[PDB]
Amino acid sequence: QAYVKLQVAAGMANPSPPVGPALGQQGVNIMEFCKAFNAKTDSIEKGLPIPVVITVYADRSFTFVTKTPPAAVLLKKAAGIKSGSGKPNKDKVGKISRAQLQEIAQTKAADMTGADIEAMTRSIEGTARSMGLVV
Amino acid sequence: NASRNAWKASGGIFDIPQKETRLKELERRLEDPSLWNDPEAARKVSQEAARLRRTVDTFRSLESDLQGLLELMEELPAEEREALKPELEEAAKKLDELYHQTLLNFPHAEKNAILTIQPGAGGTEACDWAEMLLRMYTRFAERQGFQVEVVDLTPGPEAGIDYAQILVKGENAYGLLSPEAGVHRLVRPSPFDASGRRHTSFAGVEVIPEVKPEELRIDVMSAVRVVHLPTGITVTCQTTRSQIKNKELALKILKARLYELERKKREEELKALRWGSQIRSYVLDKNYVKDHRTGLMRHDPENVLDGDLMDLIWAGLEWKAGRR
Amino acid sequence: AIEALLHDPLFRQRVEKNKKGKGSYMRKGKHG
């Protein structure tokens, strides 16, 4: 019932410019969602984006559960790079170690639908490779 | 120095009433998904957002380095605050970057250009003037880490050079030289007249960005030219000794010219539907150089001529930007 | 446009009269 993940940085108050009223296409108000996000934020660090479930009921009060920080941003943060790559195979912009990746993987385990952390690690590695970074 | 810095910073403030209101308007009407359904609108918002984004990152420096300076910079510069005064050097750099950004970003401004220099009346004197002008541009290119490719050069009989057409390529070439384009006036006592009365000669500077099979003819004279006949303007090359390279060079210049003819005409037409004198002067007697447009005067002509004045160019660019 | 503009008169060569020169003689001075 109108559930979609679509937003930016959690810490910045009321990010209406990037998406904003897409969540507010349905009968729920713009003020509420933002407020909720803000509330959520105080338990966690500011600056990073976050996704959340948007089950828009007919009553106008919605249930919501956060997920882990975006895969990409997390991956970037261990790397220490802003612009990942343009034309990655032709020349490498940066690179990552596997241990770090593994470490990163374990902290997301709650949202990650998988038992073996090894699998998660390998997924992360793959993602990194795709971005443009030879492990 | 402090005063200068302040002045510089004031410009940055000058773009505070633009950034906030604009941003607000964009989020209020453009960000919306039911507005978004039209592509054009989205595009507009993106453009509008671009303006905002520029103002965000670069204003911080202006504000953050200003407010933190005064507490530690006040009394001590030499001892313990030798970092703290040259901490504001960073701020200065940032400011410069902002200013330069403002100046550039405009259509075709990155792509290199091919300025022709054309002399004026005076005959013998005038050709010398042209040569001098050419030299200054060459030195400017040298100064700014550019590579100049000499295409047309044509000597005048009694003295100097009649015609030249010089192509430089590199980092935002056109942007810098695009203002210059126009008449440059040489107000000085002729070395050729025995009387030594003051004279006035001129030089056009045509500056253009770089950007049919049977209606072009290619003729050899090892020299080469590419005469696009329908328009009717020719180009002639003499840079390299190898022929094919020369031909190629000619082709690009001609292409540029074609574009130039088109665009200007189009603009004129639009204007129809909807500087007078010399741009610059150089007055060697007086040791004195008024750009008539933009009201700046440099008092060491020699410096300007030896190597073209980046500062002057920047001012000119700013004026042009404003007009745009 | 650049080319013809140059050709036009406003950009003709200027020469000045002389005060102690050869073609100097002022019959009547500026001021009486």
From Swiss-Prot, chain A:
Asked if Ribonucleoprotein is a keyword of the record, the answer is: yes
Q: What is this protein called?
A: Large ribosomal subunit protein uL11
Function text? Forms part of the ribosomal stalk which helps the ribosome interact with GTP-bound translation factors.
N6,N6,N6-trimethyllysine: modified positions? 35
- Keyword tags: Methylation, Ribonucleoprotein, Ribosomal protein, RNA-binding, rRNA-binding
Which residues lie in coiled coils? Answer: none
Assembly and oligomerization: Part of the ribosomal stalk of the 50S ribosomal subunit. Interacts with L10 and the large rRNA to form the base of the stalk. L10 forms an elongated spine to which 2 L12 dimers bind in a sequential fashion forming a pentameric L10(L12)2(L12)2 complex.
**Pfam families under this entry?**
Ribosomal_L11, Ribosomal_L11_N
Question: What HAMAP family does the entry give?
Answer: Ribosomal_uL11
Identify residues that carry N6-succinyllysine.
Answer: 67, 76
Please provide, in alphabetical order, the Gene Ontology terms of the cellular component aspect for this entry.
cytoplasm; cytosol; cytosolic large ribosomal subunit
Which CDD domains does the entry link to?
A: Ribosomal_L11
Q: Which family does it belong to?
A: Belongs to the universal ribosomal protein uL11 family.
Taxonomy of the source species: Bacteria, Pseudomonadati, Pseudomonadota, Gammaproteobacteria, Enterobacterales
What is an example of a GO molecular function annotated in this UniProt entry? rRNA binding
GO BP, one annotated term: ribosomal large subunit assembly
Q: Which gene encodes it?
A: rplK
Concerning InterPro entries, the annotation shows:
Ribosomal_uL11 (IPR000911), Ribosomal_uL11_bac-typ (IPR006519), Ribosomal_uL11_C (IPR020783), Ribosomal_uL11_C_sf (IPR036769), Ribosomal_uL11_CS (IPR020785), Ribosomal_uL11_N (IPR020784), Ribosomal_uL11_N_sf (IPR036796)
Curated annotation (Swiss-Prot), chain B:
**Compartments where found:** Cytoplasm
Q: Which InterPro entries match?
A: PCRF (IPR005139), Pep_chain_release_fac_I (IPR000352), Pep_chain_release_fac_I_sf (IPR045853), PrfB (IPR004374)
SUPFAM superfamilies hit by this protein: Release factor (SSF75620)
Superkingdom of the source species? Bacteria
Q: Name one GO cellular component term.
A: cytoplasm
- GO MF: rRNA binding; translation release factor activity, codon specific; tRNA binding
**Mainly resides where?**
cytoplasm
Record's keyword terms, sorted: Cytoplasm, Methylation, Protein biosynthesis, RNA-binding, rRNA-binding, tRNA-binding
Q: What Gene3D superfamilies would the database entry show?
A: 3.30.160.20, 3.30.70.1660, Release factor
Q: Spell out the Pfam families in the cross-references.
A: PCRF, RF-1
Q: What does this protein do?
A: Peptide chain release factor 2 directs the termination of translation in response to the peptide chain termination codons UGA and UAA. In endogenous ribosomes interacts with P-site tRNA and 23S rRNA. In the presence of truncated mRNA in the 70S ribosome, ArfA and RF2 interact such that the GGQ peptide hydrolysis motif of RF2 rises into the peptidyl-transferase center and releases the ribosome. Recruited to stalled E.coli 70S ribosomes by E.coli ArfA, but cannot be functionally accomodated in the peptidyl-transferase center. Note T.thermophilus probably does not encode arfA.
Q: Could you describe the subunit structure of this protein?
A: Interacts with the ribosome. Interacts with ribosomal protein L11. Recruited to stalled E.coli ribosomes by E.coli ArfA.
Q: Which NCBIfam families match?
A: prfB
| The family this protein is said to belong to | Belongs to the prokaryotic/mitochondrial release factor family.
UniProt-recorded name of the protein = Peptide chain release factor RF2
| Gene that this polypeptide is encoded by | prfB
From Swiss-Prot, chain C:
Please provide the Gene Ontology terms (biological process) for this protein: regulation of translation; rescue of stalled ribosome
For bias type Basic residues, the affected ranges are 19-32
* Keyword line: RNA-binding, rRNA-binding, Translation regulation, tRNA-binding
| GO molecular function terms noted in the UniProt entry | ribosomal large subunit binding; rRNA binding; tRNA binding
Q: Give the recorded effect for residue 4 to T.
A: Loss of ribosome rescue activity. Does not affect binding to the ribosome or to tRNA. Still recruits RF2 to the ribosome
Keyword RNA-binding found = yes
Asked if the keyword Phosphoprotein belongs to this entry, the reply reads: no
Which phenotype arises from disrupting this gene? Cells lacking this gene are viable, but those lacking both arfA and ssrA are non-viable.
Note the effect listed for residue 27 to A: No change in kcat for peptidyl-transferase by RF2
Query: Which portions of the sequence form the region Disordered?
Result: 16-32
Regarding protein family, the annotation reads: Belongs to the alternative ribosome-rescue factor A family.
Note, other:
Active protein is only produced when SsrA(tmRNA)-SmpB-mediated trans translation is limited. ArfA can be synthesized from truncated mRNA, via ribonuclease 3 and the SsrA tagging system. In the presence of SsrA, the stalled ribosome is rescued and the incomplete nascent ArfA is tagged for degradation. In the absence of SsrA, truncated ArfA chains are released from the ribosome and are functional.
- Function, as annotated: Rescues ribosomes stalled at the 3' end of non-stop mRNAs. This activity is crucial when the stalled ribosome cannot be rescued by the SsrA(tmRNA)-SmpB quality control system. Binds the 30S subunit, contacting 16S rRNA with the N-terminus near the decoding center and its C-terminus in the mRNA entry channel; contacts change in the presence of release factor 2 (RF2, also named PrfB). Requires RF2/PrfB to hydrolyze stalled peptidyl-tRNA on the ribosome; recruits and probably helps position RF2/PrfB correctly in the ribosomal A site so RF2's GGQ motif can hydrolyze the peptidyl-tRNA bond.
What is the name of the protein in this document? Alternative ribosome-rescue factor A
User: What is the organism field in this record?
Assistant: Escherichia coli (strain K12)
Q: What is the lineage of its organism?
A: Bacteria, Pseudomonadati, Pseudomonadota, Gammaproteobacteria, Enterobacterales
Included range, full protein: 15 to 46 of 72
